[PDB]
Amino acid sequence: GYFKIYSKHTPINLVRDLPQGFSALEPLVDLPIGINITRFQTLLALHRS
Amino acid sequence: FNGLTGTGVLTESNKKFLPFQQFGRDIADTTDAVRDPQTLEILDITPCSF
Numbered sequence: 001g002y003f004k005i006y007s008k009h010t011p012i013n014l015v016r017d018l019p020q021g022f023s024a025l026e027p028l029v030d031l032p033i034g035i036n037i038t039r040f041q042t043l044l045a046l047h048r049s
Numbered sequence: 050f051n052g053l054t055g056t057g058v059l060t061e062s063n064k065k066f067l068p069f070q071q072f073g074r075d076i077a078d079t080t081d082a083v084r085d086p087q088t089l090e091i092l093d094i095t096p097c098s099f
Contacts, residue, residue, distance in 0.1 A: 004069065031067045 032049040050083045055094060062091030 006025035012018070051071070057063060066084050073081035082093050 001059065027069050 001032055001036075003031050003033045003037070005029070051086055052085075053080065055080055055083075057094045057096045060093045060095060062093045064091060066091055079080070 004027040006027045006036045008023045008025045010019060010021070053072075062082050064073075064082065066082070068089075071084050073083075075081040079096075080094050082091055084091050
């Protein structure tokens with residue numbers, strides 16, 4: 001029932017390929033949501049043209 | 050501390066827990082250090098010398 005969000009910023013030389021070096025993720029905070037999650041989706045910020 | 054009772058000398062901590070982390074327990078499972086509840090300052094736990 002605890003959800004943790006991890007943020008790591010690593011400079012990447014390759015345009016898309018992930019870096020060989022290990023990246024250590026750090027959780028900002030621990031939140032007791034108490035509800036199991038089985039689906040996730042990303043959010044897009046889009047502006048009118 | 051937070052309903053957990055231990056007997057040891059209390060000293061300030063050079064080490065710093067991450068914000069999510071509140072306590073540190075060693076390999077024996079004894080608490081290595083306790084972060085103060087009222088203010089977020091890490092306190093090292095050293096058992097009284099025997």
